């Protein structure tokens, strides 16, 4: 909805930003994983 | 950067003006990062952050040593200045009162303590 608590805005933003491509240089430092 | 020993060789208001100066410098460097900066400036950000931490550390320890000096030899001192081992250890009987004995038991160990001896084969 619209009348959303501010914690929800942080909660929604973090959940969405988890779906983000893992950087190329990240792989170059041995190993980094998903999920 | 900032060395901790020469930081500790200064006064509190001098440490405050240094902290204010460093916070300004950090703010300018983060402005440079959004406007497009060089690796030197981006590397200077971390050093400034650690330098702020060192100044804050020195200020806080000087403040707390003053509190420890003020409360030295007082029956009651602030909770953050008291020991923090565990909750259970703080509730335990002290070695003094854990060793308190009745006069009856004091007389027994005074007159009939465990003796030193040996048995010949």
């Amino acid at each position: 909805p619209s009348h959303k608590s501010f914690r929800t805005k942080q909660k929604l933003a973090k959940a969405a930003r988890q779906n983000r491509p893992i950087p190329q240089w990240i792989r170059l430092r041995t190993g980094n994983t998903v999920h | 950067a900032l060395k901790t020993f020469e930081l500790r060789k200064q006064s509190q208001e001098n440490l405050a003006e240094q902290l204010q100066e460093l916070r300004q410098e950090l703010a300018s460097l983060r402005v440079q990062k959004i406007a497009g900066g060089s690796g030197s400036k981006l590397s200077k950000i971390k050093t400034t952050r650690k330098d702020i931490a060192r100044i804050l550390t020195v200020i806080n320890e000087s403040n707390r040593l003053a509190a420890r000096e003020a409360y030295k030899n007082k029956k009651y001192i602030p909770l953050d200045l008291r020991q923090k081992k565990t909750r259970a250890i703080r509730r335990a009987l002290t070695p003094y009162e854990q060793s308190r004995k009745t006069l009856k038991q004091i007389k027994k160990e005074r007159y009939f303590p465990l003796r030193k001896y040996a048995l010949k084969a």
């Binding site: - | 030193k116 040996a118 048995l119 010949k120 084969a121």
Partner: protein
């Protein structure tokens, strides 16, 4: 395999390793100085007591003892006074 053990397996903080266990290490002698100076740390306490001239126990022993070599009427006694006991070894004499 526990959640609390998987917690520090995936952690970067090192395990609080302590190195204290060395079996066969017998407790060192404090207490008597004369006994300490004549105690050989390898031997057992029964071997040490017998070598020093002392009795480890004043009662019977509850088992076979080691054999390393081929070994070669109230009133009268209630009133008698046992004439001390000889000191076999030097440590007992000391």
């Amino acid at each position: 395999a526990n959640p609390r053990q998987r917690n520090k397996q995936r952690s970067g903080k090192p395990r609080l390793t302590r190195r204290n266990a060395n079996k066969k290490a017998k407790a060192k002698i404090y207490g008597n100085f004369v006994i300490q100076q004549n105690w050989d740390k390898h031997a057992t306490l029964r071997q040490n007591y017998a070598r020093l001239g002392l009795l480890a126990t004043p009662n019977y022993v509850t088992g076979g003892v080691e054999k390393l070599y081929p070994d070669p009427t109230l009133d009268d006694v209630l009133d008698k006074e046992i004439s001390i006991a000889p000191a076999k070894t030097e440590v007992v004499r000391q």
